[PDB]
Amino acid sequence: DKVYQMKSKPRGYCLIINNHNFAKAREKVPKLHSIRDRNGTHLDAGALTTTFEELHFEIKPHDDCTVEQIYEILKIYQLMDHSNMDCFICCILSHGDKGIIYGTDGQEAPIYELTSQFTGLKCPSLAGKPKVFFIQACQGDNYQKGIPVETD
Amino acid sequence: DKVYQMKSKPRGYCLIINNHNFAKAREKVPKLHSIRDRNGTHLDAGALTTTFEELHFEIKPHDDCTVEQIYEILKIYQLMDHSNMDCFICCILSHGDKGIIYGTDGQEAPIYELTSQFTGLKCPSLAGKPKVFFIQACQGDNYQKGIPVETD
Amino acid sequence: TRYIPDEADFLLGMATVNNCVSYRNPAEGTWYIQSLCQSLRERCPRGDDILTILTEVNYEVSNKDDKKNMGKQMPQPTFTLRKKLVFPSD
Amino acid sequence: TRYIPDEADFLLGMATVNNCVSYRNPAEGTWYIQSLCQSLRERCPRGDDILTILTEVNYEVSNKDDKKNMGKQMPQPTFTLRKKLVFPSD
């Protein structure tokens, strides 16, 4: 089986956007009046840091980002030279809704607006290299129902 | 590694919705005036039949389906008893656009309206069993651009 | 008994990413379905799982081109599978 | 040279299917990220690929529940990867 080259050190950048404080969302966006701070999110940021540092990525953490700050960070990495990297990872920890994630300011970023910054034409030094996005957020307000099955 | 049970004969039903003739679409839907018949689609239907019969599925072909006919077919299988099956497969060969496939009549079926008929609550006899959908259709009218890379 | 999500155990194999075309050769079949069938027939007897197989389909279809428009095609699987999916021959 | 699609070689790991919630334990972390990290730390040294790993994450998260609402969570990867993705330790 063909496998992506994965031998550079660092392997690549692993961005962590870690949104905890939604005071601005509660203040400025009517429907998000009672959106809660994401207590415990630092435990995810730390787990990702440990995990991907162990796997030889260079971790780039960013805490409490508004939508504009998120776009600013991604633009930096879109324009960066990844020629000496074999991979790029971007982790987003935040609130969200259908197809979007929220900045701490309660503005919306469509997920595909984030990923599309790293296409081959937009970021040539990542062409042919894996680009991995992990999105920890709700994608709506519905509860996923359970169904009964036999135990394995 | 855990693996889905795959030992029944047949393994399950493999539906093939094979849309060739779009005369009705050309006749009734203004924007689809010049949508073309899908010449050669029978070659896909045959390849899928050979392939999945070889893998012990029971093939259920349906040629030239309108959107209502597609929903009728899926309802039949949603209400069927799959207790003695280990898997369900549904292949759709048609024209399409963003998030949808077309019936031969040029009406639209959102893809997730098709898959959602087979959730655990809607089809309990498939609960815990793999449900596989292959969709051969455009998902819009844009050409995917190429990017240069080194040869493997 | 145990409970799993309502939407568990799905595999959706799309011929193309959203917003874009997929291709049909009228004398041969579609890029995606013909690649899929070839890979299934070759790899299922080897015990390979469907995600490995669909990765190969991504590879193969990615190397094809529409020389009229310099067009490409990028298939895109999505899944809620909780186990390896294999289709044994025995 | 060779050409591949503009949107090739992506992996999108979503904590949940569309329209639904995902869960965070404030004393532990989120179901999805904690499962992901555990599986990565365990399986990457074994040479397992990311799709095998995300299948395990689907399995593990599928077995958790929100006992307040009898709620579940179903993660959902989507990919345009053309090769196996492994993260070696050496």
Swiss-Prot record, chains C, D:
Secretion signal span: none
Modified residues ((Microbial infection) ADP-riboxanated arginine): R24
Superkingdom of origin: Eukaryota
The name this protein goes by in its record: Caspase-8 subunit p10
Organism of origin: Homo sapiens
Highest classification ranks of the organism: Eukaryota, Metazoa, Chordata, Craniata, Vertebrata
